[PDB]
Amino acid sequence: HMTTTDRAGLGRQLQMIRGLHWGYGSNGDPYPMLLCGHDDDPQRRYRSMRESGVRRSRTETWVVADHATARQVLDDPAFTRATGRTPEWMRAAGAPPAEWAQPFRDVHAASWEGEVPDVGELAESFAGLLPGLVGDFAWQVPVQGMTAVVLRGAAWDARVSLDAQLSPQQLAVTEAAVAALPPALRALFAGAEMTANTVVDAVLAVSAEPGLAERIADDPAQRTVAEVLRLHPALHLERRTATAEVRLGEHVIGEGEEVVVVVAAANRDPEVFAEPDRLDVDRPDADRALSHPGRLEELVTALATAALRAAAKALPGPVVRRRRSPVLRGTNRCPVE
Amino acid sequence: HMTTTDRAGLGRQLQMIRGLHWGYGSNGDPYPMLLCGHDDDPQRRYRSMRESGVRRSRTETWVVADHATARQVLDDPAFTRATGRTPEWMRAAGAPPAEWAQPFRDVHAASWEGEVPDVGELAESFAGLLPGLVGDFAWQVPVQGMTAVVLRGAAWDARVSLDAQLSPQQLAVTEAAVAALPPALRALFAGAEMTANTVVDAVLAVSAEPGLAERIADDPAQRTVAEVLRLHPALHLERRTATAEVRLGEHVIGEGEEVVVVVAAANRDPEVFAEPDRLDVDRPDADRALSHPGRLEELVTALATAALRAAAKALPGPVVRRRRSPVLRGTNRCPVE
Amino acid sequence: SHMRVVFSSMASKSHLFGLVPLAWAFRAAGHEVRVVASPALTEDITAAGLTAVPVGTDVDLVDFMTHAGHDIIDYVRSLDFSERDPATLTWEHLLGMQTVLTPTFYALMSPDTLIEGMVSFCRKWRPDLVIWEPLTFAAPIAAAVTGTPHARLLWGPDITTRARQNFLGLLPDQPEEHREDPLAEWLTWTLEKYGGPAFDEEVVVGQWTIDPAPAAIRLDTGLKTVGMRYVDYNGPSVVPEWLHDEPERRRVCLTLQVSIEELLGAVGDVDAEIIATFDAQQLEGVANIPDNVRTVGFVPMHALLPTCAATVHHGGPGSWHTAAIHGVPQVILPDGWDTGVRAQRTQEFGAGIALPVPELTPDQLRESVKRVLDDPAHRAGAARMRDDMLAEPSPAEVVGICEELAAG
Amino acid sequence: SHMRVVFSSMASKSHLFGLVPLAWAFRAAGHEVRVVASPALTEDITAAGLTAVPVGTDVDLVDFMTHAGHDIIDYVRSLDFSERDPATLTWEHLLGMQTVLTPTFYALMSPDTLIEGMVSFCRKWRPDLVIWEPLTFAAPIAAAVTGTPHARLLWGPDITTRARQNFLGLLPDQPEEHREDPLAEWLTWTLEKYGGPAFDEEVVVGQWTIDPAPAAIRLDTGLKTVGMRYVDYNGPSVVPEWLHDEPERRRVCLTLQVSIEELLGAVGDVDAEIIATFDAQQLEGVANIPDNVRTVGFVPMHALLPTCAATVHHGGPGSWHTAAIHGVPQVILPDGWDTGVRAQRTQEFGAGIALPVPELTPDQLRESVKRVLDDPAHRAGAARMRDDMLAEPSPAEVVGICEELAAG
């Protein structure tokens, strides 16, 4: 529910930011071209972002992809997931983030401080699902799992929320999320989509590797889920904002100045990980950066771990991916058996 | 001789002054309406001018018609026939008198200080002219007379000069005068037309009166010529200009400020002359104002006196008069026998 | 076929405007159109979206008017033709107009400079046709010298033509020596300056005349007339947001006496919404006059008049013609020779009321506004005038009639 | 039969001008014509002698441009269609244009305020036809909502239409989820705001399109085209006294690089009188460049081009179209996407030379000016274009074609 007048105003705002993101991006700056997510392969932009280390974009934002500085800021407490400051280009464009982004940035900020059942007792319910995956199995896993600790369609409409906070979605897509967006439950909806693509990417990675395929059936592993969230994290980008001025490699980061941690880039540094862009289940390199308070990451890793173990029996069409997801990189169609 | 360009400029000037004279005149002021001479009878305007005494017009000019003040200024030496000052309306109109009026005002200024033969020896030549009048007799009298002390057609073209000094004539009429205008000879041309209308008005007045008709034949008189130049003077208006400031009845007349003596009005004051607008040959009233140096008036009175005496034998159509002559009031057609 | 058309007006914003829609008519037809006038009229030409050809130099009216001309403004307000008195038709009176208006107005405009300026442009640009405002005698002279076809484009009545036809009509009664013709004398000695043809009344009136006025309110002159459907132009027009809506109650619009402008209270006693064209400056003294009255300043008449049941105005061509084409009954408050004559013609036809401003009374206005609103006759009269005008060709169609006439 | 025509342009002096002669064409035909636009364009409407209906409020570009928009000026100068490279026809590239230009330009103009402003006026004034500048999407929306017939009036090439037709042409290759259409999404959710009809490509292109460009240099779009004989309008035009005379020697006029404007010496080595449209301010540094060169500032092109053997210009519509109709060979110095495309089309036809400004050399200009003056082919090419254009109806005739089309 919302008037066709404010709808019109919102649509105009979402379209202006994306328009400026693409313009800035096509002109040179790689962070807004990534933010548009017009490509399915972001790995060359991540190399360029890591190569630079730290660079602030055309928008005010500081882009941290060097694993050394990425860990440095994620560990620093000044950098938080709160409402920062409005950059001049945005208010001048007539699209304050406080308007086009607002529900979605409160979702990113939400913390799920609840008991996380990692029992694997979940994998018991999850067994009878694949008969003798995006919506028929992967999205089925968080719903039935959180039910045995949040409606299917409701969570599916809100699934774009953690992209919408940095990247403007379509008007109907933005509209459907706000209407289906509920604190903890809000944060649980977010984790549901985090878990959902983890299941897809894992089954996709297992499908290619010769070992992982028949090996997962031998011991139903947490190691595959760990490695998958390195090459394909829950959140590729991590929006943070400084409360007090911070010094990161000779750079002064002001109060309310936004910093975005490029986790997917960081998690493939040639100096930190051996064969980074290669799927290695048995790798000593466990210095991977992720996610800030709460245990939502711990919740998804459990839902995905239980899921991978249940589908260990079945493990031995064209894959379409969501095109406006620079943060979480979701799949929409994953065929078949 | 003169270019069609300066001709165009002159025509425009003559037409502007007359345009403003008529406008000012129709609006109220009687002096410029008189100056246009659209009427053949000026006697009501002269009553109004005398009634006032002295009044300055819409143009700068002082209008003196009261016989008392008329004589007062004609006798005063400060008031002269020289080039005065240009009034603001004229230069603003774009017609300085120094341009549209110039030859003609030098004619008015001219003095004929030459021996005036009043012998009446002239009336001997003038005898054989009328067989058993404007051009066939009246204009014939000054030519043959001045020849026995100046060509016929030449004097006829210049005949408008003493009107042109106050009243703008037509462009061709102004053009023809300048080309036929020659000092003394210049002043003699002027006297020729002065004499010419005197002959016409006299024969016209004699024609109506019962006495004067057969009486002029008895003693060929100077008394008729005297009385005629009272009711019909050589110059009805008399352009003068102050050299030094003069006080006339409570009025300050500035240097170069024009004064026009309305001689024809003055010469019919009810307080000065008995039955003024009536032709009386035997009248004691000889206090009539006229004409300033020279003897031109004395010359014309002689040419006209000789003329009236010669035509004493013949004395016992529609009369057309020149329409732009407020100064001298000339006749163009005087039929017949 | 493609033409080079020259439009000439004297340097008056009040006069150029009557030529504007026909100039644009020609250019939309694909013809080359240039408005040849004095440097003063340039801003007004360009503000009409037209190309200006400023020729010659300006004339100092300010100096002429302060010292000489002002009295001629007092002289003109005297003349009155709307009643046809025998006193005004005397030779003395008529030659009077001819003697004063020829130098002080017709020739005051059309100066030395403009005429040589136009003659130079025409000789060079080689126009195919010259359309001129009825009192800009430089244009027919230029057109005579160049041998270019020329036509007059009227706005209000052709009062000068009627006054002249009468003046010439008396010339034969007067003796050969008492004859005079200032306008002919001027134009003749002007035509000689450029070596041009002999004088013809064709230089005073055109070769033809275009009049946007309905046939019945036109004066009888006998001149080749091309009637034209009127299309308003009155300078920069901006529609206010309030004039978008269809009116609620019936509307009377008042546009600009001896009534101390306190006359607003008189039209206020009328049962209608009044729209007064007065600014907040013009009505700084009025304190009790408004009630049903609306003051909105200068607004587009071609946008306001289509919404009025009646109209009260000075009698100006723009107001007259615009109201006339919209079948809007009129209450004219004349002050000029040109306005009175027309105000009288339109009252005779029954398209309104003529209220001379010297004789004007607030009782007369209240009654007159009440009369046009209530008597269905004034509307019916105004309906006939409108119908006459819509039956005449549009400036678009008049382009072809000129094109053809220009050839022969 | 009488019509109510609305003309709408975005608040750009550079865009309104292309509608001006056709607006005047309609009003000369006797129709009611109103130019509905934002308050900024009001002075320019009134300076075209047209009636302005300013609706809504102004848009603060100064603030938007200083902080956000400037980069989009840098983005636009990159795009180049004149060569048809396969790289520019990729889905990624084309959706790019659609994603950036839709909000930052089309919708930046046409704001919230203007669209409701036009929809309000149209609902009230009840127009019979809406003629609009090709990138003022408020007008077709207003016309869609009101159900009023509407048509586009082009000036330069229809490059946006060609770019869009290609973009839509690739939409089917992309998966259902990867599909997007910013301009359709915007216009669709806009049509919903006024409850208007469903989205139709008819809101993007018109119901028909009027193009003053010769048939051969028009892009293939398939859209209902009404060709029109071009009649120039370029704001306030004043003819200088020097432009009255027929030229002595042959004339080349230069109108506005990386050549430090010292290029005047290059055109000076040409055997011809050069007329440079530069002011004394613009040429304050040039000390040896003039010899056969004349600097006269901004002058009317529709008065200068009829006297030129050749022309050197930026490629702007006014310069292109005016030279084209006069059969004047052209040396275009393009810098825009719109100018390059057209400069390439006119060179292919042989009506001139296209010299891109990034690649531009003073040797190229001297040779190019020498080439158009001496090779009778460029004149012959320019002669065909001229002949094509004079065979199209005048804006006067186009009024009837619209009138008829508006009915059905």
Author numbering:
A (entry chain B), B (entry chain B): 20 to 151, 158 to 174, 180 to 212, 215 to 252, 255 to 325, 330 to 354, 360 to 380
C (entry chain A), D (entry chain A): 19 to 274, 285 to 436
The authors write:
For example, the in vitro activity of the GT EryCIII, which produces erythromycin D (3) using TDP-d-desosamine (2) and 3-α-mycarosylerythronolide B (MycEB) (1) as substrates, was enhanced by the addition of its auxiliary protein EryCII. We report here the purification from recombinant Escherichia coli of a stable tetrameric complex of EryCIII and EryCII and the solution of the crystal structure of this complex, providing to our knowledge the first structure for any macrolide biosynthetic GT. The auxiliary protein shows significant sequence similarity to cytochrome P450 but lacks the essential cysteine residue that coordinates the heme iron. All of these belong to the GT-B structural superfamily of GTs, consisting of two domains, each adopting a Rossmann-like α/β fold, in which the N-terminal domain contains the acceptor binding site and the C-terminal domain encompasses the nucleotide disphospho-sugar (NDP-sugar) binding site, and catalysis occurs at the interface between them.
The asymmetric unit is composed of an EryCIII·EryCII heterodimer, and in agreement with the analytical ultracentrifugation data, the biological unit is tetrameric consisting of two EryCIII·EryCII heterodimers arranged in an almost linear array. The stoichiometry of the purified EryCIII·EryCII complex in solution, determined from sedimentation velocity data, is α2β2, and this agrees exactly with the stoichiometry found in the crystal structure, where the EryCIII·EryCII complex appears as a dimer of heterodimers. The EryCIII·EryCII interface is predominantly composed of electrostatic interactions between the N-terminal helix of EryCII, which occupies a groove formed by three helices [α-3/(3a), α-4a and α-6a] of EryCIII. In the difference density map of the refined EryCIII·EryCII complex, residual density roughly the size of a sugar could be observed in the putative catalytic pocket, which is likely to be due to the binding of a small ligand that originates from the E. coli expression host. As expected for EryCII—and indeed the macrolide auxiliary proteins generally—the conserved cysteine is absent; thus, they are not active P450 enzymes.
